Amino acid sequence: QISQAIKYLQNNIKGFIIRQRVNDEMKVNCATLLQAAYRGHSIRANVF
Amino acid sequence: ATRANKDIFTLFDKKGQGAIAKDSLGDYLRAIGYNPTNQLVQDIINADSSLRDASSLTLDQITGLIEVNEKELDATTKAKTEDFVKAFQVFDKESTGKVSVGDLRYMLTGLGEKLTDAEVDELLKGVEVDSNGEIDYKKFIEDVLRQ
Amino acid sequence: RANKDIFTLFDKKGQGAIAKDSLGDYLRAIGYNPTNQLVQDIINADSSLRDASSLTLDQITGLIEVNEKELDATTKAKTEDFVKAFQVFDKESTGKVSVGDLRYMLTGLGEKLTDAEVDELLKGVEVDSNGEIDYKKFIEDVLRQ
């Protein structure tokens, strides 16, 4: 009598996991693009 | 809406080919906000000859599939905390409102549409587990449904 | 953007070649903003450099041509693009971010910066009572320089 609820929960958990995964990737990508810009800017400021 | 979903699509399109592997469809649907079963995703694919024969799908094709199956997909975003209270009751017969990580893993990986341990571990990264190794399942459900 | 004069500045020994490990900063010096990963892939995609200790202007120039497309992309993004992407760290769209979260994403995610580099970036940056910073102004003040 609990298999239905469990399956529904598992479906929602899969949605939760993917969204969390995507959010984390977006955070990593954001950090990465920002760090690259900083390094480029920083190197140039120091060379010239 | 589309801008955010377009960027999610771009994120999935690793090869920047304007199309993602058909096998990633369910995850893209999850990424944009739905909670379909793997079965619903297959039924959607198998019902459309173009989709069924495709190796990859463009954003246009996906936007089209969503339109067609919008009612069924929207239905996957209606779960309520109470819909799972009894499931946890099986592991909290004394109604403490808490369950151990062990029992959560058992329920998720040994019952229903069995999830893998890797899925549960990824899940646990976004779940609040106290120093006692126990979870308030009402809060847990809320976070899961939170969106 | 390959530039001989900049190469010369890097070649402090006039030996006609610069350390392979200095490839990333040279690419940055001439105007690109490659990630450290892209620099490694560029070097790794060329089997010939496998045991190369240094690179000449000719070799570097070839790598820039082969990877011109990706390198050019590292220059397209404007300030508004970073601000837009930064919203993932501010869902409430409050336009603010705790200095704690900012330090974390800069030193704990991606190609991590050192706490010292971050301390420097936060020098002069205004932090309110809630301990938050206006990330749009921060990003602007870091690039517009």
Swiss-Prot record, chain A:
Disulfide bonds: none annotated. Residues 2-26, 27-48 form the IQ domain. It is found in: Bud neck; Bud tip. It comes from the Eukaryota. Homodimer. Interacts with calmodulin (CMD1) and the myosin light chain MLC1 through its IQ repeats. Binds to the membrane receptors SEC4 and VAC17 to transport secretory vesicles and the vacuole, respectively. Binds to KAR9, which transports BIM1-coated cytoplasmic microtubules that are attached to the spindle pole body into the emerging bud, thereby correctly orienting the mitotic spindle. Interacts with YPT11 and MMR1 to accelerate mitochondrial distribution to the bud. Interacts with SHE4 and localizes it to the bud tip. Interacts with RHO3 and SMY1, putative regulators of MYO2 function. The myosin motor domain binds to actin. Present with 4339 molecules/cell in log phase SD medium. Moves with an average velocity of 3 um/s along actin cables. Myosin heavy chain that is required for the cell cycle-regulated transport of various organelles and proteins for their segregation. Functions by binding with its tail domain to receptor proteins on organelles and exerting force with its N-terminal motor domain against actin filaments, thereby transporting its cargo along polarized actin cables. Essential for the delivery of secretory vesicles to sites of active growth during bud emergence and cytokinesis. Belongs to the TRAFAC class myosin-kinesin ATPase superfamily. Myosin family. This is Myosin-2. It comes from Saccharomyces cerevisiae (strain ATCC 204508 / S288c). The lineage of its organism: Eukaryota, Fungi, Dikarya, Ascomycota, Saccharomycotina. The gene is MYO2. The chain holds residues 806 to 853 of 1574 of the full protein.
UniProtKB/Swiss-Prot annotation, chain C:
There is a cross-link at residue 112 (Glycyl lysine isopeptide (Lys-Gly) (interchain with G-Cter in ubiquitin)). It is found in: Bud neck; Bud tip. CDD domains: EFh. Gene3D superfamilies: EF-hand. This is Myosin light chain 1. PROSITE patterns: EF_HAND_2 (PS50222). One of its GO terms (biological process) is septum digestion after cytokinesis.
